[PDB]
Scaffold this active site. Structure first.
Site, PDB file in Angstrom:
ATOM      1  N   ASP A 112       0.773  -1.241   0.000  1.00  0.00           N
ATOM      2  CA  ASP A 112       0.000   0.000   0.000  1.00  0.00           C
ATOM      3  C   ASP A 112       0.809   1.299   0.000  1.00  0.00           C
ATOM      4  O   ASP A 112       0.384   2.325   0.538  1.00  0.00           O
ATOM      5  CB  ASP A 112      -1.042   0.027   1.123  1.00  0.00           C
ATOM      6  CG  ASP A 112      -0.449  -0.153   2.499  1.00  0.00           C
ATOM      7  OD1 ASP A 112      -1.222   0.010   3.466  1.00  0.00           O
ATOM      8  OD2 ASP A 112       0.755  -0.464   2.619  1.00  0.00           O
TER       9      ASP A 112
ATOM     10  N   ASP B 258       6.816  -0.323   2.849  1.00  0.00           N
ATOM     11  CA  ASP B 258       6.334  -1.064   1.685  1.00  0.00           C
ATOM     12  C   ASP B 258       7.402  -1.008   0.582  1.00  0.00           C
ATOM     13  O   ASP B 258       7.720  -2.015  -0.065  1.00  0.00           O
ATOM     14  CB  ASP B 258       5.052  -0.439   1.138  1.00  0.00           C
ATOM     15  CG  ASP B 258       3.868  -0.662   2.037  1.00  0.00           C
ATOM     16  OD1 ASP B 258       3.250  -1.751   1.957  1.00  0.00           O
ATOM     17  OD2 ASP B 258       3.562   0.254   2.827  1.00  0.00           O
TER      18      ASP B 258
ATOM     19  N   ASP C 285      -2.424   2.865   2.887  1.00  0.00           N
ATOM     20  CA  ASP C 285      -1.477   3.697   3.620  1.00  0.00           C
ATOM     21  C   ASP C 285      -0.718   4.630   2.655  1.00  0.00           C
ATOM     22  O   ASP C 285       0.456   4.946   2.870  1.00  0.00           O
ATOM     23  CB  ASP C 285      -0.515   2.798   4.407  1.00  0.00           C
ATOM     24  CG  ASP C 285       0.311   3.564   5.435  1.00  0.00           C
ATOM     25  OD1 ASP C 285      -0.183   4.578   5.975  1.00  0.00           O
ATOM     26  OD2 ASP C 285       1.449   3.132   5.721  1.00  0.00           O
TER      27      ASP C 285
ATOM     28  N   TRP D 245       0.081   9.955   7.139  1.00  0.00           N
ATOM     29  CA  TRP D 245       0.866   8.790   6.740  1.00  0.00           C
ATOM     30  C   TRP D 245       0.762   8.505   5.250  1.00  0.00           C
ATOM     31  O   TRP D 245       1.726   8.056   4.637  1.00  0.00           O
ATOM     32  CB  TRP D 245       0.411   7.534   7.488  1.00  0.00           C
ATOM     33  CG  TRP D 245       0.493   7.615   8.977  1.00  0.00           C
ATOM     34  CD1 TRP D 245       0.896   8.684   9.729  1.00  0.00           C
ATOM     35  CD2 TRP D 245       0.124   6.591   9.897  1.00  0.00           C
ATOM     36  NE1 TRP D 245       0.794   8.388  11.065  1.00  0.00           N
ATOM     37  CE2 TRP D 245       0.323   7.107  11.199  1.00  0.00           C
ATOM     38  CE3 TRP D 245      -0.358   5.284   9.754  1.00  0.00           C
ATOM     39  CZ2 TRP D 245       0.054   6.358  12.352  1.00  0.00           C
ATOM     40  CZ3 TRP D 245      -0.625   4.537  10.906  1.00  0.00           C
ATOM     41  CH2 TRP D 245      -0.415   5.080  12.186  1.00  0.00           C
TER      42      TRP D 245
ATOM     43  N   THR E  78       1.916  -6.561   2.198  1.00  0.00           N
ATOM     44  CA  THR E  78       2.394  -5.539   3.128  1.00  0.00           C
ATOM     45  C   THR E  78       1.375  -4.386   3.327  1.00  0.00           C
ATOM     46  O   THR E  78       1.648  -3.400   4.007  1.00  0.00           O
ATOM     47  CB  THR E  78       3.774  -4.998   2.668  1.00  0.00           C
ATOM     48  OG1 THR E  78       3.650  -4.381   1.383  1.00  0.00           O
ATOM     49  CG2 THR E  78       4.783  -6.153   2.545  1.00  0.00           C
TER      50      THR E  78
ATOM     51  N   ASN F 208      -3.033  -2.653   9.370  1.00  0.00           N
ATOM     52  CA  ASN F 208      -3.361  -3.369   8.129  1.00  0.00           C
ATOM     53  C   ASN F 208      -4.676  -4.172   8.213  1.00  0.00           C
ATOM     54  O   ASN F 208      -5.426  -4.244   7.240  1.00  0.00           O
ATOM     55  CB  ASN F 208      -2.219  -4.306   7.715  1.00  0.00           C
ATOM     56  CG  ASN F 208      -1.040  -3.566   7.098  1.00  0.00           C
ATOM     57  OD1 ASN F 208      -1.089  -2.352   6.861  1.00  0.00           O
ATOM     58  ND2 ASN F 208       0.031  -4.302   6.830  1.00  0.00           N
TER      59      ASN F 208
ATOM     60  N   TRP G 151       8.225  -2.941   9.603  1.00  0.00           N
ATOM     61  CA  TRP G 151       7.125  -3.900   9.448  1.00  0.00           C
ATOM     62  C   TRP G 151       7.133  -4.710   8.149  1.00  0.00           C
ATOM     63  O   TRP G 151       7.289  -5.937   8.161  1.00  0.00           O
ATOM     64  CB  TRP G 151       5.773  -3.185   9.537  1.00  0.00           C
ATOM     65  CG  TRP G 151       5.532  -2.395  10.787  1.00  0.00           C
ATOM     66  CD1 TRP G 151       5.273  -2.885  12.041  1.00  0.00           C
ATOM     67  CD2 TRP G 151       5.455  -0.964  10.890  1.00  0.00           C
ATOM     68  NE1 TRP G 151       5.035  -1.849  12.915  1.00  0.00           N
ATOM     69  CE2 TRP G 151       5.141  -0.659  12.239  1.00  0.00           C
ATOM     70  CE3 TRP G 151       5.618   0.090   9.974  1.00  0.00           C
ATOM     71  CZ2 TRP G 151       4.987   0.660  12.694  1.00  0.00           C
ATOM     72  CZ3 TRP G 151       5.464   1.402  10.426  1.00  0.00           C
ATOM     73  CH2 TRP G 151       5.151   1.673  11.778  1.00  0.00           C
ATOM     74  N   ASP G 152       6.943  -4.018   7.030  1.00  0.00           N
ATOM     75  CA  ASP G 152       6.888  -4.683   5.736  1.00  0.00           C
ATOM     76  C   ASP G 152       8.233  -5.210   5.268  1.00  0.00           C
ATOM     77  O   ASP G 152       8.292  -6.191   4.528  1.00  0.00           O
ATOM     78  CB  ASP G 152       6.314  -3.739   4.674  1.00  0.00           C
ATOM     79  CG  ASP G 152       4.941  -3.203   5.053  1.00  0.00           C
ATOM     80  OD1 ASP G 152       4.272  -3.818   5.914  1.00  0.00           O
ATOM     81  OD2 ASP G 152       4.534  -2.171   4.482  1.00  0.00           O
TER      82      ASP G 152
HETATM   83  O1  IMH Z   1       3.114   5.277  11.725  1.00  0.00           O
HETATM   84  C1  IMH Z   1       2.991   4.751  10.640  1.00  0.00           C
HETATM   85  N1  IMH Z   1       3.344   5.394   9.415  1.00  0.00           N
HETATM   86  C2  IMH Z   1       3.225   4.828   8.103  1.00  0.00           C
HETATM   87  N2  IMH Z   1       2.749   3.579   7.969  1.00  0.00           N
HETATM   88  C3  IMH Z   1       2.387   2.909   9.123  1.00  0.00           C
HETATM   89  C4  IMH Z   1       1.863   1.577   9.269  1.00  0.00           C
HETATM   90  C5  IMH Z   1       1.570   0.497   8.065  1.00  0.00           C
HETATM   91  N3  IMH Z   1       0.785  -0.631   8.613  1.00  0.00           N
HETATM   92  C6  IMH Z   1       1.598  -1.873   8.741  1.00  0.00           C
HETATM   93  C7  IMH Z   1       2.088  -1.957  10.234  1.00  0.00           C
HETATM   94  O2  IMH Z   1       1.134  -1.743  11.278  1.00  0.00           O
HETATM   95  C8  IMH Z   1       2.676  -1.711   7.659  1.00  0.00           C
HETATM   96  O3  IMH Z   1       2.304  -2.347   6.407  1.00  0.00           O
HETATM   97  C9  IMH Z   1       2.865  -0.164   7.457  1.00  0.00           C
HETATM   98  O4  IMH Z   1       3.118   0.228   6.095  1.00  0.00           O
HETATM   99  C10 IMH Z   1       1.660   1.364  10.589  1.00  0.00           C
HETATM  100  N4  IMH Z   1       2.038   2.507  11.345  1.00  0.00           N
HETATM  101  C11 IMH Z   1       2.476   3.405  10.379  1.00  0.00           C
HETATM  102 CA    CA Z   2       2.367  -1.149   4.357  1.00  0.00          CA
END
Ligand code: IMH
Ligand code: CA
Ligand code: IMH
Ligand code: CA
Ligand code: NI
Lengths: 327, 326
Positions: B9, B14, B39, B82, B136, B185, B259-260
């Protein structure tokens, strides 16, 4: 040839683009020092970014090293925390962490660490052989501090102050529940200091308020052109910082990011950047809805300030793109 | 190398994930990617996917592949702030070198025609060998495929490595209406998440916050990409991570994580983490815990392999090395 200049900034993206402009134009500017204030950044981050950019440029274009000092000034009204984080991100950019450059900063860091921003500004100016131009891209707290402590012994050594701040005939950019939106952020951070500066006789002041900075919003098209110069360290650096601002207008309807400090520094390099108009400037310091506003005062014999008007945008845009090619 | 498809996303991790999968051509054959308007703003996320692909294609042996935009809509959208990160990357100089942008401009018309969800379905089903899906972003697209093709789709999937949920740790969705147990997610589209984790006949590797919490993006590591500025991918990855090291201070402890990137690393090499089987269900109800991933006692409930004790140093070294691909 070059005139002496001290950059009095508060470490945000345009503050650093401003630094690059002044530093890269060695024929017009002799950068003898800089101070960073804990306003639109977290001073430690701004301090290190200032240092890292200076070292990168010293190794790549022979830029003479100069003193960097952290100001002790404290806020009247702090900048939003989200804006102050930008210097942190820049401290971690790979372009500013190249070993040879980081090694040099590490060697001179302890020394610069010992300086107090405000006293340093006063000494660089007062101990300079020739007059000194102060480029203020953050709040006015340090020039004011120097004015209060040394008075005429300080101002007489000042060629002029080129200031990013205020909004005279256009609205401001300080939008909070208790304000009316007529104040600009740099003045709003420390109104009393700004007033002290704007009221000081025997001090030449060039003011780049929003009236003029509103003509240079940071747009993608122009920013992407830095992609044409990735062979230059400064283009990766400047384009990157600008790329981090193109979303603002989309994030806050029209209240986008502008090249405020950049346009201001550009005038220091070449006054052709904009013409000026004499205006008696006072600053609202009371706790009113327009606290921090810069307004014309008609008090008898009030010192004049030269407000920038109708900036040469194209000239400024070309200057920045070519200056980002110094190395 | 095995066939992989990136279902993301468009946020910073990502894109780092994308670099990891694409740069490791020895283990991963990247046959396509789709971007979801989650996102990120799909247009920016789509364009950056293209710009990264062309930059790599032009500097290393990375075959071009199809990129499609998902038609998926949100149940609970991500925070606007974000979502802007893709717009920022779209204007970065390292992604706007003339030779690469020219290539992208040239192949854009072909890709902007693909529908992300259908593309994911076709890439998976028509593949000769089985395909590994690295998810992701939300699970909307894999669910769409499951709903539309069922077993014809799932039987062709090697496994789904998913970045999502929180099982034995706190989630990361902190809003006035939530209790913090849900992970973003899953939260974005709970029902699609429910469909995937409850799907029989589909192998799932789940990287929940339980494992990703061991990989916060921190300054010291980020600055190491500064020792590799002669590699485009290091400037790209280091720049993206540099834009994340502030979150922890800004959000009082609720920082940014790889994360991703961790999820993708495992696809490159499973030594990244061991897995524990767990019956994972999802809360779809409009309650304070909407989007929560919870163990279920329901009999015959499909198992999901949740990642445990990731090899942090291993992952961190993999990214730095991979970042030297070009
Ligand atoms: O604080 C943030 N900023 C940008 N993206 C995320 C995310 C998005 N969600 C997933 C992790 O919770 C992951 O795929 C990431 O791209 C969680 N927290 C943030
Ligand atoms: Ca993501
Ligand atoms: O939205 C913003 N982000 C970061 N800095 C500023 C500023 C700071 N204040 C001055 C212009 O209002 C300028 O020096 C700039 O660094 C105003 N608005 C923003
Ligand atoms: Ca500033
Ligand atoms: Ni080719």
């Amino acid at each position: 040839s070059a005139k002496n200049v001290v950059l009095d900034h508060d470490g945000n993206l345009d503050d650093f683009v401003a630094m690059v402009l002044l530093a890269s134009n060695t024929e017009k500017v002799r950068l003898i020092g800089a101070l960073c204030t804990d306003a639109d950044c977290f001073v430690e981050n701004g301090f290190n970014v200032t240092g890292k950019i200076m070292c990168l440029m010293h190794n790549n274009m022979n830029l003479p090293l100069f003193p960097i000092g952290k100001s002790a000034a404290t806020a009247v009204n702090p900048f939003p925390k989200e804006w102050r984080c930008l210097a942190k991100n820049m401290d971690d950019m790979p372009i500013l962490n190249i070993p040879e450059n980081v090694e040099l900063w590490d060697k001179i860091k302890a020394e610069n660490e010992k300086y107090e921003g405000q006293q340093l500004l006063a000494d660089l100016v007062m101990n300079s052989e020739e007059k000194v131009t102060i480029c203020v891209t953050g709040p006015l707290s340090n020039v004011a501090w120097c004015i209060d402590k040394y008075g005429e012994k300080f101002t007489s050594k000042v060629e002029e102050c080129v200031i990013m701040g205020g909004a005279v005939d256009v609205r401001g950019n300080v939008f909070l529940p208790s304000t009316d939106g007529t104040a600009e952020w740099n003045i709003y951070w420390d109104p009393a200091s700004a007033k002290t500066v704007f009221g000081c006789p025997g001090l030449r002041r060039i003011m780049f308020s929003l009236d003029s900075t509103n003509t240079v919003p940071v747009r993608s098209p122009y920013v992407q052109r830095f992609g044409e110069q990735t062979n230059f360290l400064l283009s990766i650096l400047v384009g990157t910082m600008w790329a981090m601002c193109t979303h603002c207008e989309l994030l806050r309807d029209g209240d986008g990011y502008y090249a405020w400090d950049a346009l201001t520094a550009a005038y220091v390099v070449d006054q052709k950047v904009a013409n000026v108009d004499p205006v008696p400037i006072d600053v609202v310091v009371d706790k009113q809805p327009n606290e921090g506003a810069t307004v014309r005062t008609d008090a008898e014999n009030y010192p004049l300030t030269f407000v920038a008007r109708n900036p040469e945008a194209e000239f400024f845009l070309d200057m920045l793109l070519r200056s980002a090619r110094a190395c």
